[PDB]
């Protein structure tokens, strides 16, 4: 269903793109989203779906946008309207100069120096998992490995119990892929929910784990309030449960129908590092936005204050302008350009952590697991959203051609 377009949009703008369900999803997510590029559509055009709204197409106005946050305001990030209002996250929905005195805290229990100390847990459970599907032949890879395998770490590190993983993952993922079960409202209130007990404990007793810390804190001096704390511990969760879990399984599939590219891979291992990013451009996978604080001309297209704009992390380095062949994955391309992670000053926290975890996972099972396909018949199903994701994804190997380490 279409919204009525509002009399300020001209009409030659107007292009209907729907992303919870694009037309052309069973040809890839990343395609789906790239008929926004071809040459006959403008750099920036209205969407009649899921209430109306802006979409910026290109790599450079994304940047811009993403820059200037005095017109771009982060307080409704999320398309739909509704989704957007009751988006109280923090720090993504504060900007400048409120936002930043949360960004340290939130640096501090997901930055570099935590991860050194967690190299080991990474390292550790990657084989522990990878080890124990070898020998079947067969897995589920999202429910056996992308899932179990970052999650795990993120509640390990957060003090949250392994228990809790299923109930939160359904409540992050009603928020970035809706099942129409639960509107974002309703998905934030039963997070919020989870955690106010868990925090007013933590408030009591100071500790280590990422809970703590951030209850415990203080911002630009000052401590940190039960409710503030509430909405930064739910950011961190929505991050830890959503972003690593989907990007694996784009990338796993790929590397198992691509054998030239697996291959690559398994005799030159220090490509690893470079494949990452990569795959980071090519299965890039977020979309979130803005909404307009002001009237404003951007290139040449009259913005109304209130309007909401998408800017979709993932188009940049799609866009032929910034990478030639952009479909084409090139693990020695020289100048790998993308906004994979944000632009701007809300540039992903975790950047750190997903990196090494998405190394470690290549590193281990290329090691163990060489040779892989998806099982005979299959066909791979995606889902669109805030945070694009993979359904299902079964592998098939012969595990004599397995190396047990
Ligand atoms: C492949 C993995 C990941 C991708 C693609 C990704 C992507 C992004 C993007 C695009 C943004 C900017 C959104 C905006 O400007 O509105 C962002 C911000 C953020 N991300 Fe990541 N992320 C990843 C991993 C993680 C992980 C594992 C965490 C763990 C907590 C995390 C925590 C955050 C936080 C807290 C912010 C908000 C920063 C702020 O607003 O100042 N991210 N991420
Ligand atoms: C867009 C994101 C990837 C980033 C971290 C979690 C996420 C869904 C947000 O709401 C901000
Ligand atoms: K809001």
Same mark, same amino acid.
């Given at each position: 269903?279409?919204?009525?377009?509002?009399?300020?949009?001209?009409?030659?703008?107007?292009?209907?793109?729907?992303?919870?369900?694009?037309?052309?999803?069973?040809?890839?997510?990343?395609?789906?989203?790239?008929?926004?590029?071809?040459?006959?559509?403008?750099?920036?055009?209205?969407?009649?779906?899921?209430?109306?709204?802006?979409?910026?197409?290109?790599?450079?106005?994304?940047?811009?946008?993403?820059?200037?946050?005095?017109?771009?305001?982060?307080?409704?990030?999320?398309?739909?309207?509704?989704?957007?209002?009751?988006?109280?996250?923090?720090?993504?929905?504060?900007?400048?100069?409120?936002?930043?005195?949360?960004?340290?805290?939130?640096?501090?229990?997901?930055?570099?120096?935590?991860?050194?100390?967690?190299?080991?847990?990474?390292?550790?459970?990657?084989?522990?998992?990878?080890?124990?599907?070898?020998?079947?032949?067969?897995?589920?890879?999202?429910?056996?490995?992308?899932?179990?395998?970052?999650?795990?770490?993120?509640?390990?590190?957060?003090?949250?119990?392994?228990?809790?993983?299923?109930?939160?993952?359904?409540?992050? *993922?009603?928020?970035?892929?809706?099942?129409?079960?639960?509107?974002?409202?309703?998905?934030?209130?039963?997070?919020?929910?989870?955690?106010?007990?868990?925090?007013?404990?933590?408030?009591?007793?100071?500790?280590?784990?990422?809970?703590?810390?951030?209850?415990?804190?203080?911002?630009?001096?000052?401590?940190?309030?039960?409710?503030?704390?509430?909405?930064?511990?739910?950011?961190?969760?929505?991050?830890?449960?959503?972003?690593?879990?989907?990007?694996?399984?784009?990338?796993?599939?790929?590397?198992?129908?691509?054998?030239?590219?697996?291959?690559?891979?398994?005799?030159?291992?220090?490509?690893?590092?470079?494949?990452?990013?990569?795959?980071?451009?090519?299965?890039?996978?977020?979309?979130?936005?803005?909404?307009?604080?002001?009237?404003?001309?951007?290139?040449?297209?009259?913005?109304?204050?209130?309007?909401?704009?998408?800017?979709?992390?993932?188009?940049?380095?799609? *866009?032929?302008?910034?990478?030639?062949?952009?479909?084409?994955?090139?693990?020695?391309?020289?100048?790998?350009?993308?906004?994979?992670?944000?632009?701007?000053?809300?540039?992903?926290?975790?950047?750190?952590?997903?990196?090494?975890?998405?190394?470690?996972?290549?590193?281990?099972?290329?090691?163990?697991?060489?040779?892989?396909?998806?099982?005979?018949?299959?066909?791979?199903?995606?889902?669109?959203?805030?945070?694009?994701?993979?359904?299902?994804?079964?592998?098939?190997?012969?595990?004599?051609?397995?190396?047990?380490?």
């Amino acid at each position: 269903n279409l919204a009525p377009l509002p009399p300020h949009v001209p009409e030659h703008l107007v292009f209907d793109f729907d992303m919870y369900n694009p037309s052309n999803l069973s040809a890839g997510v990343q395609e789906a989203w790239a008929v926004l590029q071809e040459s006959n559509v403008p750099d920036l055009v209205w969407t009649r779906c899921n209430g109306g709204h802006w979409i910026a197409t290109r790599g450079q106005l994304i940047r811009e946008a993403y820059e200037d946050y005095r017109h771009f305001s982060s307080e409704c990030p999320f398309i739909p309207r509704e989704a957007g209002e009751a988006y109280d996250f923090i720090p993504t929905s504060m900007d400048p100069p409120e936002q930043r005195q949360f960004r340290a805290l939130a640096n501090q229990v997901v930055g570099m120096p935590v991860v050194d100390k967690l190299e080991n847990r990474i390292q550790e459970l990657a084989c522990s998992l990878i080890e124990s599907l070898r020998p079947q032949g067969q897995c589920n890879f999202t429910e056996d490995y992308a899932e179990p395998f970052p999650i795990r770490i993120f509640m390990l590190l957060a003090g949250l119990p392994e228990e809790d993983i299923p109930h939160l993952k359904y409540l992050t *993922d009603q928020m970035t892929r809706p099942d129409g079960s639960m509107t974002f409202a309703e998905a934030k209130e039963a997070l919020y929910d989870y955690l106010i007990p868990i925090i007013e404990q933590r408030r009591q007793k100071p500790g280590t784990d990422a809970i703590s810390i951030v209850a415990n804190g203080q911002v630009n001096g000052r401590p940190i309030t039960s409710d503030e704390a509430k909405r930064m511990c739910g950011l961190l969760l929505v991050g830890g449960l959503e972003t690593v879990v989907n990007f694996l399984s784009f990338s796993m599939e790929f590397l198992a129908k691509s054998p030239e590219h697996r291959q690559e891979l398994i005799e030159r291992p220090e490509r690893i590092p470079a494949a990452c990013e990569e795959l980071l451009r090519r299965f890039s996978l977020v979309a979130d936005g803005r909404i307009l604080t002001s009237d404003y001309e951007f290139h040449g297209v009259q913005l109304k204050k209130g309007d909401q704009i998408l800017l979709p992390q993932m188009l940049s380095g799609l *866009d032929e302008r910034e990478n030639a062949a952009p479909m084409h994955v090139d693990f020695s391309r020289q100048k790998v350009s993308h906004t994979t992670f944000g632009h701007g000053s809300h540039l992903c926290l975790g950047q750190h952590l997903a990196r090494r975890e998405i190394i470690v996972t290549l590193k281990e099972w290329l090691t163990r697991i060489p040779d892989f396909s998806i099982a005979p018949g299959a066909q791979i199903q995606h889902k669109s959203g805030i945070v694009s994701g993979v359904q299902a994804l079964p592998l098939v190997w012969d595990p004599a051609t397995t190396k047990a380490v």
